[PDB]
């Protein structure tokens, strides 16, 4: 399938266990997809002060489109030192990997695959 069913554990940047994919653009793309198929990806929320807090480079997921059966349609866009590696609407969130750490909330999206 194009697209994929997904409801994403929302983690607090403070509870991120590995707060990144890897070490290139490519990679981090690359491993994000895996543990988005797996079951075991996490979503921070992005507000003033979390990336920073977060390992580049930065994987979003953006909305692609304006959210079928409730999940929003989205694309996943990198970020390296300031230039993003994919053109997409507005960051619902950076991805990480999700190591055990409780959410605070569920964010279904339809993740074009």
């Given at each position: 399938?194009?697209h ?25 793309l ?10 075991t990806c ?12 977060l ?21 996943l866009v ?10 997409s609407?507005e ?23």
């Amino acid at each position: 399938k194009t697209h994929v069913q997904l409801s994403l554990p929302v983690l607090q940047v403070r509870d991120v266990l590995v707060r990144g994919f890897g070490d290139s653009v490519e990679e981090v793309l690359s491993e994000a997809r895996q543990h988005l198929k797996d079951g075991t990806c996490g979503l921070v929320e992005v507000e003033k002060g979390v990336l920073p807090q977060l390992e580049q480079p930065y994987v979003f997921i953006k909305r692609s489109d304006a959210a079928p059966h409730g999940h929003v349609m989205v694309e996943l866009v990198a970020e390296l030192e300031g230039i993003q590696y994919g053109r997409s609407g507005e960051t619902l969130g950076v991805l990480v990997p999700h190591v055990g750490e409780i959410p605070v909330a569920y964010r279904k999206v339809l993740l074009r695959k």
